[PDB]
Amino acid sequence: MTDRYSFSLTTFSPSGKLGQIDYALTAVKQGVTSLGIKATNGVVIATEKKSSSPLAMSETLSKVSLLTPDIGAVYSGMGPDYRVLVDKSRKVAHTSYKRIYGEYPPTKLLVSEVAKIMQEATQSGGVRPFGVSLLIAGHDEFNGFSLYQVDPSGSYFPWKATAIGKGSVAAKTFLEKRWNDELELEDAIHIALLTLKESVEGEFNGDTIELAIIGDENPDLLGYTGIPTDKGPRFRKLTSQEINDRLEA
């Protein structure tokens, strides 16, 4: 039968390039700017909130998502693909790792699972590639802090600091001139705020930008007491009031 198959939606152009992946990269480059900075004591992940209308409640939709208590992610590109991939990553963290080893996966392995899912969409007969780019920040016992970027083709690379989106080149240069091996988490937060200040055309306040950190364990966020060995989450999303206070300072 002629319905027992469907031809590949992604094929090589004569120059040797996969056109759908390149167009997905273009769609990413048309998105809002997001960035990540890796320090000695933590990782900062930041992005610019956007709204169709002022009447929208920007707190309902969050571009920053906790994958595990020690791993978070941010984006540039198309939102629904983000939502789908985040749900899948949260499920895979449990099905593949926590139900097997009793512990959450390291950052690199979760990044690898997400990247495999994204790659399988570029060799298919009925789904287009995901038109989105990913920044994943995390911490683990045997690797410390880590920051990764994942592309629509499924390639991922580790970065000391990087940015994606519409203002990515200027932000990359600004981070290149403002990074060193002895930076601290607060310095990284300040640098991230300064970098985002150069990309937001409208109001640069606490209700239009979104930040999260991978820092030290927060036992006050566990929800229970009594077990000294139970570490609190290291992922923490800064509130709007904290962002406003840091901007004033």
Binding site: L66, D87, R90, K91, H94, K98, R99, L222, G223, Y224, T225, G226, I227
Partner: protein
Amino acid sequence: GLSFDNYQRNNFLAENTTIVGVKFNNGVVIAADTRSTQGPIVADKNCAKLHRISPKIWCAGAGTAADTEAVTQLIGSNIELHSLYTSREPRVVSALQMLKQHLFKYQGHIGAYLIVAGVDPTGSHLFSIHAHGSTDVGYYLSLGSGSLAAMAVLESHWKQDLTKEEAIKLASDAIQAGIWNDLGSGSNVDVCVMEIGKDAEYLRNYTP
């Protein structure tokens, strides 16, 4: 999923605790003994039997130990994923539904009997769960081989108006009766207190 391989081979080869839950005016308490026995032998004199489905939803089980642990962990993973998906605190009814349907699917072949207590935005909840998939609600429950002595203690000194301290004392006394009068129970008493609007408090080796 779970495999049925070597079932015929195994047939061919063959052919050749005290747990209590109490409810008080602003929350729930769940307590258990700490003796682990591999038959008549005391394997461990200090073993934790209170398990955490979610930070404010706790449970304690009897029956097949591996089944109890596996079912609790699987439902905890499902609860965590659901809470992330809905961006809301998990509810005790959701865990109850997941447990009931999972146990009904396997037609009683998973030997887990549970007491599940917790608090959520809707209030405080205590439930009993049977291995065949039936559940029930209560104000005080007991489970295990020492459950009759504990239930006698509970029937002796339970009333509608209970403070946190009185509830903790009553649960401790029920576990103590199970410890003294039942050969399967003994050693220490582990407690977990959940209040409406507060963090869960897990007290390991409360009285001794």
